[PDB]
Amino acid sequence: LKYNVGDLVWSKVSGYPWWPCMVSADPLLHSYTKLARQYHVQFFGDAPERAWIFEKSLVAFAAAEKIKLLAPISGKLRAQWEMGIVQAEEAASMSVEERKAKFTFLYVGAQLHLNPQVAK
Numbered sequence: 001l002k003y004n005v006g007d008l009v010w011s012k013v014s015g016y017p018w019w020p021c022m023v024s025a026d027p028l029l030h031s032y033t034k035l036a037r038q039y040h041v042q043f044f045g046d047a048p049e050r051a052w053i054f055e056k057s058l059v060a061f062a063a064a065e066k067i068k069l070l071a072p073i074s075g076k077l078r079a080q081w082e083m084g085i086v087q088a089e090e091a092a093s094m095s096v097e098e099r100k101a102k103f104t105f106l107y108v109g110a111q112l113h114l115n116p117q118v119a120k
């Protein structure tokens with residue numbers, strides 16, 4: 001396995017630029033990887049987005065030399081992407097256990113929430 005929970009990656013989703021995220025356990029399935037291999041990630045930004053991504057569409061954040069990193073220009077997506085970058089940079093400066101406690105999304109009822117530390 002190339003990744004574990006808490007690892008910072010860039011993931012490519014169709015219709016989006018390469019986005020900063022953190023490998024995490026799917027809070028419904030209780031698993032972070034499965035079978036080609038997939039990994040569950042949460043996307044840094046202003047909304048609690050998550051997804052199962054194939055390993056070919058993931059690379060470490062901070063194989064990595066072969067991808068083309070392109071930043072969004074469109075205002076709305078760019079500001080969300082910049083928020084994700086600021087958060088992934090702060091997470092990169094912390095230990096794996098500190099970033100799991102600070103950035104892991106929380107289910108409150110059936111509603112997926114940003115980690116209250118991030119929300120505040």
Ligand SMILES: CCN(Cc1ccncc1)c1cc(C)nc(N2CCC[C@H]2CNC(N)=O)n1
Nearest residue numbers: 013016019043044045046047048049050051080
């Ligand atoms: C490639 C990462 N992103 C951008 C993003 C991430 C985290 N926060 C903001 C934007 C994703 C990924 C996925 C699977 N879905 C989405 N979304 C669907 C609805 C619009 C957008 C963002 N959500 C929102 N309420 O504004 N975005």
